[PDB]
Ligand SMILES: *C(=N)[C@H](C[C@@H]1CCNC1=O)NC(=O)[C@H](CC(C)C)NC(=O)[C@@H](NS(C)(=O)=O)C(C)(C)C
């Protein structure tokens with residue numbers, strides 16, 4: 204099972220941010236709201252000149268709210284692809300947090316929010332070209348990615364756009380877009396690779412599925428490069444599974460590269 | 475756009491998880507008000523052989539209990555069986571008790587599991603109730619007492635508490651009133667589950683999620699009536715569809731009636747031929763109609 208860490212600390216920070224025709228989500232920490240800067244675009248379907256929109260920005264046209272609280276915007280600045288709004292009230296439920304970027308193959312959690320309303324939570328995996336495969340629709344931009352590591356809450360992702368190939372692109376909380384994509388409605392291209400993760404077969408045989416009977420093969424056919432997986436409990440070497448990688452019956456009709464080895468173990472053997 | 479198994483947010487349920495231990499057994503309990511609900515097999519002296527719960531209740535001492543949230547203790551002042559559940563009154567009211575109700579989850583319905591190890595919530599994920607009262611979670615040692623919850627129209631329902639894993643890997647739990655789902659016993663037995671029956675309502679919804687995500691190779695120039703599908707379902711381990719009314723919205727947006735998807739089910743039950751539908755190699759009944767609608771269109 205793909206799992207997500209609990210969302211209790213992140214839920215009270217989600218606000219509804221609207222400007223013009225655009226309604227999305229924002230991250231309310233302290234007296235600041237971080238949101239995707241394309242919320243102030245007069246037309247998100249056509250190319251945006253972000254310096255023109257910031258030149259014509261009228262702070263009184265914002266609508267930032269959480270439940271029955273209306274958060275008046277006192278100031279607005281860009282930071283990368285993110286918009287940072289200073290609001291007239293501190294969030295009394297701001298949790299202890301740090302910021303952090305996610306590398307390819309890693310896993311984190313997505314709190315999907317719909318026009319300011321948290322609705323779902325699920326775990327993701329940072330893909331090849333800096334994308335993730337989640338399930339975002341209209342109104343979910345500003346959805347927050349987070350990871351909790353040893354009593355530390357890390358905000359690691361804010362949603363921005365979906366590519367033409369259905370993959371999802373976002374930034375970190377400091378404004379750098381993962382994968383280097385731009386926040387324009389022009390077409391962009393994800394790369395053509397699969398993960399250490401395809402750990403998926405190691406869990407496929409602990410559950411009873413054993414229908415098992417390489418970096419050279421993996422470098423020229425879109426697979427990441429790779430045995431220290433040791434815990435030996437199922438009795439099958441990894442090159443006895445690297446053979447299965449070399450692609451009408453797996454817990455799934457294709458190879459699954461979404462679970463890190465640490466997760467799948469910390470889920471089968473726990474602790 | 476994508477389809478993923480979702481879980482509703484867990485903020486209201488987290489402050490109610492506590493660590494409960496008696497002797498060598500440690501699990502989790504649900505702290506609501508001044509009461510903590512946990513599985514009654516925590517006072518059993520040996521959980522690997524048949525347990526006489528009458529004797530274990532006769533020899534329980536309240537001071538041997540260890541109830542705590544975030545390593546601060548709660549004093550147990552009363553222990554009592556309610557069904558397969560232990561109901562413990564504690565010396566402190568939970569100040570974060572959310573408004574809630576209790577209810578039982580029916581077969582085919584979806585809910586959320588907050589997996590907890592030793593009183594600390596570890597992860598959250600959505601699940602679906604199988605026909606024989608079981609679910610396919612990822613419970614390991616120390617996760618009993620993990621709480622199943624669902625929220626409907628801003629009403630928080632507690633619906634599940636974990637107890638045991640069957641021999642076949644299925645996971646068995648109780649509602650919050652001590653009634654074990656499926657009628658299984660809270661014993662270290664070799665009880666068997668039975669024949670799993672796929673939810674037809676859920677399989678149709680999963681195929682609508684495929685169509686919405688651009689996958690339509692399974693739809694052909696054929697459609698089968700409702701009763702004809704219901705007759706086929708009686709003998710192929712599929713539940714009967716009472717109507718096509720819960721799919722009026724999905725059929726309008728995709729342009730594919732349910733009867734066309736009904737024919738695709740009878741055909742795809744044979745097999746996928748290696749083709750995968752939204753990362754799935756066989757028919758999947760984990761997603762409910764409203765679950766699909768909320769993920770695809772918000773609502
Ligand atoms: C943000 N709330 C929304 C989320 C989308 C909706 C479908 N799935 C998603 O992830 N996205 C947008 O508002 C952006 C806006 C631009 C200016 C970044 N739109 C898109 O991502 C766009 N793709 S693009 C930029 O042309 O590659 C869509 C709307 C055509 C998918």
Ligand SMILES: *C(=N)[C@H](C[C@@H]1CCNC1=O)NC(=O)[C@H](CC(C)C)NC(=O)[C@@H](NS(C)(=O)=O)C(C)(C)C
Pocket residue numbers: 501515521613614615616617618619637638639640641645660661662663664665
């Ligand atoms: C409780 N924390 C634990 C959860 C298990 C551990 C493995 N997966 C789970 O879901 N449950 C138990 O230890 C129970 C206790 C008895 C009194 C019901 N026993 C089992 O789940 C048992 N299965 S059984 C029905 O006895 O064959 C195991 C321990 C063999 C899995």
